Amino acid sequence: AMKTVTVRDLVVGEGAPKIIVSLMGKTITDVKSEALAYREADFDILEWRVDHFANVTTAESVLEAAGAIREIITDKPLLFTFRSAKEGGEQALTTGQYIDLNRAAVDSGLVDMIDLELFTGDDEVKATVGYAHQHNVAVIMSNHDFHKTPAAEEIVQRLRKMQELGADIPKIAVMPQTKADVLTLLTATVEMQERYADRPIITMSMSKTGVISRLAGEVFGSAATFGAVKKASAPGQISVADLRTVLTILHQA
């Protein structure tokens, strides 16, 4: 049976899917103005897309920015996410730099969760998951394909490997090229959820064509969904207000 994941008092895996929004700021000044602009938006988890932050290799700066968000947004769990260039991110980093950055986030005491990419390297992932858990920081383990939708079987295999590597919440986002691809993503979601999952999972088919996948998580088994405040962090994200509207209708229908 599926256990839930509680982050800064939000319980993920129960009830209606939770809404995650991404905050993107190049400088400390932008991060602060965006955080202020997000303050009153209707979402559940705040993801900080750190790869949008210039010169992330200056430790003191990343810390300062994290502290700035944490003081403006006091009522939401914070997810620290450096999306690698490999998986659609805005910046290149070495594996070493990537792991150091996430370990720095963990020991800061400022973040509730970190995002770690499944294909970073098994050894590095196991170690960083261990380090996170030792500091009471949850891990969303992710995989993204911005060009195509892999076969359902391959999608399920990846989500299963995320569980094996210790993810608190497995997450996969794929790009549909056809309408059938959207159904392939939902099939994988259902099969994973019904046969192998023992914790919450997050799945999505990107683009306007895949939008339905961001709304039907309650029936098909995705525990959270991404929405946009102003600009999307990945294609297909709709406004958090509209997202909450639909999720509530579906929760009570």
Q: Does 226 bind Cl ion (CB under 5 A)?
A: yes
- C-alpha 90/C-alpha 41 separation (Å) is 25
Interface segment toward a second copy; rule CB under 8 A; list 40-48, 78-86, 139-147, 219-227: 219-227
Q: Which of 110, 185, 234, 247 binds Cl ion (CB under 5 A)?
A: 234
Q: Can 144 be counted among the known catalytic residues?
A: yes
- Number of residues counted as binding Cl ion (CB under 5 A): 2
Burial (CB < 10 A; 0-12, 13-18, 19+), residue 180, is: exposed
- C-alpha 106/C-alpha 121 separation (Å) is 19
Scanning residues 194 to 213, which ones bind a second copy (CB under 8 A)?
A: 194, 208-209, 211-212
Interface segment toward Cl ion; rule CB under 5 A; list 132-140, 157-165, 227-235, 241-249: 227-235
Nearest residue to 52 via CA among 234, 188, 212, 246: 234
Amino acid at site 143: N
Interface segment toward a second copy; rule CB under 8 A; list 34-42, 92-100, 106-114, 241-249: 241-249
Give me the least distance between CB of 24 and a second copy, in Å please.
20
227's enclosing H/E stretch is strand 224-227
Question: Is the backbone of residue 250 left (phi > 0), alpha (psi -120 to 50) or beta?
Answer: alpha
- Among candidate residues 3, 26, 144, 230, the one labeled active-site is 144
Which three-class secondary structure state does DSSP give residue 47? strand
Which three-class secondary structure state does DSSP give residue 191? helix
Scanning residues 128 to 187, which ones bind a second copy (CB under 8 A)?
A: 179-180, 182-183, 186-187
State yes or no: 47 annotated in a binding site. Answer: yes
For 169, which DSSP code? E
Nearer to Cl ion, 223 or 234 (CB): 234
**Centroid of chain to Cα 123:** 21
The entry of a second copy, Cl ion, none near residue 97 (CB within 5 to 8 angstroms by kind) is: none
Which three-class secondary structure state does DSSP give residue 121? coil
150's enclosing H/E stretch is none
Q: Can 230 be counted among the known catalytic residues?
A: no
- Among candidate residues 161, 171, 179, 230, the one labeled active-site is 171
Q: Does 232 bind a second copy (CB under 8 A)?
A: no
Nearer to a second copy, 142 or 203 (CB): 203
Q: Which of 125, 215, 229, 240 binds a second copy (CB under 8 A)?
A: 215
Nearer to a second copy, 122 or 242 (CB): 242
226's enclosing H/E stretch is strand 224-227
Binding site for a second copy (CB under 8 A): 179-180, 182-183, 186-187, 190, 194, 208-209, 211-212, 215-216, 219-221, 236, 238, 242, 245-246, 249-250, 253
